[PDB]
Amino acid sequence: GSAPEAQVSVQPNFQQDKFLGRWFSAGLASNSSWLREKKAALSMAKSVVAPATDGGLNLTSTFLRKNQCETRTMLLQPAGSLGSYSYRSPHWGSTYSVSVVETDYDQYALLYSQGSKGPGEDFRMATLYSRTQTPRAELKEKFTAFAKAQGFTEDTIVFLPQTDKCMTEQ
Questions:
Q1: Where are the beta strands (DSSP E) in 3-117?
Q2: What is the C-alpha separation between 170 and 161, in angstroms, rounded?
Q3: 23 has which bridge partners?
Q4: Which of 25, 57, 159, 164 is at 20 to 30 A from 42, Cα to Cα?
Q5: Reduced to 3 states, what is the DSSP secondary structure of residue 161?
Q6: Is 91 helix (H, G, I), strand (E, B) or coil?
Q7: Which neighbouring-strand residues pair with 86?
Q8: What residues bear carbohydrate chains?
Q9: What distance in Å separates the CA atoms of residue 109 and residue 24, rounded to the nearest whole number?
Q10: What is the per-residue DSSP string for 128-144?
Q11: How many domains does the chain have?
């Protein structure tokens, strides 16, 4: 039948090693009311990408709320081709393909999460992971203009600031 590989929203022959690492919260984009109700609950956010034992990817996401920091692990599998992984929670029954459109850890990275459930149904959600601790108003304009070019407005774009409220490591 068909052949593997599928650049649905991934990057070229990039090195997955230059995509991992502890990423910090920056911004996001999607279509839902919850996206707004979450902005008010802004807090610590740290996603650490790590190779999965099942040849996939296990990233740990940090989150703060009510003076409490809880970590969330997610073991994703390969989508036929490295540089891309889809999360499938059997306990719930929801699939989501995660791809990497762009990556520039030196400043930020572009993620792509697709949602599918039932006859068709498609969802678009981009994740901008900022590895820098010094935002640039010029980049903010570069990001806003980018999402704008994709026919998307601020109404479908959330902001995820970064704050050292809690952390620990060697």
A1: 21-29, 45-49, 57-64, 69-78, 84-89, 94-104, 108-116
A2: 24
A3: 47
A4: 57
A5: coil
A6: coil
A7: 77, 97
A8: 9, 31, 58
A9: 10
A10: EEE--SS--HHHHHHHH
A11: 1
What's the token pair of residue 71? Answer: 């970590």
DSSP code, position 51? B
DSSP notation for 94-135: EEEEEEEEEEETTTEEEEEEEEE-SSS--EEEEEEEE--SS-
Amino acid, single-letter form, for residue 139 = L
DSSP class of residue 15 equals -
Method of structure determination: NMR
Any long-range contacts for 2-8 (C-beta under 8 Å, 24+ apart)?
4/80, 4/81, 5/80, 5/81, 6/79, 6/80, 6/81, 6/84, 7/81, 7/99, 8/79, 8/84, 8/97, 8/99, 8/112, 8/114
AA letter at 131 = R
Enclosing domain of residue 97: 1-170
d(Cα 116, Cα 95) in Å, to the nearest integer?
6
